[PDB]
Design a protein around this ligand. Structure first.
Ligand SMILES: O=C(O)c1[nH]c(=O)[nH]c(=O)c1F
Ligand SMILES: O=C(O)c1[nH]c(=O)[nH]c(=O)c1F
Ligand SMILES: [Zn+2]
Ligand SMILES: [Zn+2]
Ligand SMILES: [Zn+2]
Ligand SMILES: [Zn+2]
Lengths: 343, 343
């Protein structure tokens, strides 16, 4: 059966949580990936260098002996955030990028953004020092339909921003529409994107047809088929400014399977093999390593990993659940068979 | 505060299940409604007069003393179903209508329909004897997107059927699109429809924005806002061939809140007040009684109820759950406040 040797990949979009879950989930990433963009959306969020330095250490405490893993920390953008604070953390090599979560006028200034025009100063600073901006591209006005929120973000926020700040390096994170696929495809060298395994593998029918399936519920939300196909074609194309970001967003089973299930997929354990399946299905394994291992590093301006991992096309059963201190974690594709696996 | 006196209403679309749940759920309907269309989608489904007569009796056993309730039984249409069997049950007054669930070529002939062209004989018989056809209007081919399935059904099944059988009386059950709203609005006297409280009250954003909410997950699936508004306008219009059908589809909480939650809303307990809210919100309480109490009877060709119930605009808390032999039932709008209630 078939062996596939690639560079040690990176995860350029990851939530590792905190506390007893941070311990549970880090091994699934640190065992396979060399570096990962850790998100700042904790409670409270990571908006200072002290919080970031501290959190980074907590991650390192969770890393198994022998694992060579490096968490690349990011900063949660808020209205109250001081440009000097972000500038300092970037200079000291604490922050790699800053993350912009959807704007909302009601949002408390300590916990997020009211509008993009409000945080212009820090965005202008990010431009000067050449710091990458990571973007959750969704407009969250109540009137806007959930399946339109990514598309709307491009018109009314993204394009105007990138025109205003021509020199800003922007990662359009976890794109899920043909709209975004095109936007990035036709954009310049300062615009890139990450794509999750679930957004390539499935569409909204998988989440809803024959029952509601909360473990495929995340954001941005699985769109219809024509959008799915767009993403698979973009990565298969060989376009060199898409790269691996899992958006591994683990929630306890009781939280996912409730009257109001949380958004997020714990895919870290199965993502790499899952990607490797989609690239094989698209007859595009020649562009696989690049997507994993090169394109992200090349965009962020970091050295590429110097070690290699192997994948094997031996079919493997995914775990039904992972034990947590309380409750469990249902992984992405739990109990399912996968075509590819790490040796 | 405000009192609203109307005729004793009917529910022209209802699932009452069987066994220990049938006992749990009948009181919620029998206490308020005079008559109700009970669906045949049991396991095994109701496809004989013996099964129907028997099931009818089981329902009557579940009805509290003093409640004047009459279950109007229906037949599940299958390929193997004998026209003479349906003709006999209709003549004997066992069957009121026959229900057509979505076609599917793989479906076992004892449990459903492969295609509409296959069951033409029984449909032609239904036409002759003037028996109403009830329709779940969705095409269930895998390729078709879930939010397009009702719209597709109109083009490729409904219109061709109604042209083929010009004299057939068809209830387009629980319509959920502007497409269906228009179709029925502009149709003839032999075409009517039911509409649920959830399809008037909410749209898909309510189910998905800020978490996945399985207790609003049913079929047909909540569409986007422009479809919601269409339904509210149609009922508010005063159009006299829409009428109350709850599609009360109760599932145990552990079944709704799982890795694969079932489709259905247990709305029977809160539906009437919920409808009364939407008609008030649409400034259309003059057409409320009709929708509840007259239009259905008028379409089915039955006498209208001769007793009256009162509603009051005293705000009332909905139960968080109802106790089942095992597990519980989370009702529609559980723990919520409602504006209208029965006295
Ligand atoms: O971390 C999460 O809970 C999470 N899950 C998501 O599916 N999307 C997000 O944008 C996010 F922040
Ligand atoms: O009875 C059910 O489970 C059910 N629930 C639904 O939401 N739609 C149906 O068509 C149906 F048969
Ligand atoms: Zn995100
Ligand atoms: Zn994320
Ligand atoms: Zn139905
Ligand atoms: Zn039904």
């Amino acid at each position: 059966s078939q062996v596939l040797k690639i560079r040690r990949p990176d995860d350029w979009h990851l939530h590792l949580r905190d506390g007893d879950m941070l311990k549970t989930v880090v091994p699934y990433t640190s065992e396979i990936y060399g570096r990962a963009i850790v998100m700042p959306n904790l409670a409270p969020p990571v908006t200072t260098v002290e919080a970031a330095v501290a959190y980074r250490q907590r991650i390192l405490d969770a890393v198994p002996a022998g694992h060579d893993f490096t968490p690349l920390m990011t900063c949660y953008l808020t209205d109250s955030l001081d440009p000097n604070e972000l500038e300092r953390g970037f200079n000291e090599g604490v922050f790699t990028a800053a993350k912009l979560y959807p704007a909302n006028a009601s949002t408390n200034s300590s916990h997020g953004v009211t509008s993009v025009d409000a945080i212009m100063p820090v965005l202008e600073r990010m431009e000067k020092i050449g710091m990458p901006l990571l973007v959750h591209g969704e407009v969250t006005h109540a009137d806007i339909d959930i399946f339109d929120r990514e598309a709307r973000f491009i018109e009314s926020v993204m394009e105007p921003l990138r025109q205003r700040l021509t020199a800003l390096k922007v990662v359009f994170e976890h794109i899920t529409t043909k709209d975004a696929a095109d936007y990035v495809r036709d954009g310049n060298e300062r615009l890139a994107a990450t794509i999750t395994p679930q957004h390539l593998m499935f569409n909204r029918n998988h989440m809803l047809v024959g029952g509601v399936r909360p473990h495929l519920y995340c954001l941005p939300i699985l769109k219809r088929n024509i959008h799915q196909q767009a993403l698979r074609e973009l990565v298969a194309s060989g376009f060199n400014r898409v790269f691996l970001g899992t958006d591994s967003a683990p929630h306890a089973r009781h939280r996912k399977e409730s009257s109001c299930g949380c958004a997020g997929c714990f895919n870290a354990p199965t993502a790499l093999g899952s990607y490797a399946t989609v690239f094989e299905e698209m007859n595009a394994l020649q562009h696989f390593e690049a997507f994993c291992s090169v394109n992200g590093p090349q965009f962020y301006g970091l050295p590429v990993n110097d070690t290699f991992i192997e994948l094997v096309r031996e079919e493997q059963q995914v775990a039904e659940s992972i034990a947590l201190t309380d409750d469990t974690l249902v992984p992405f594709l739990a109990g399912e068979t996968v075509r590819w696996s790490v040796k």
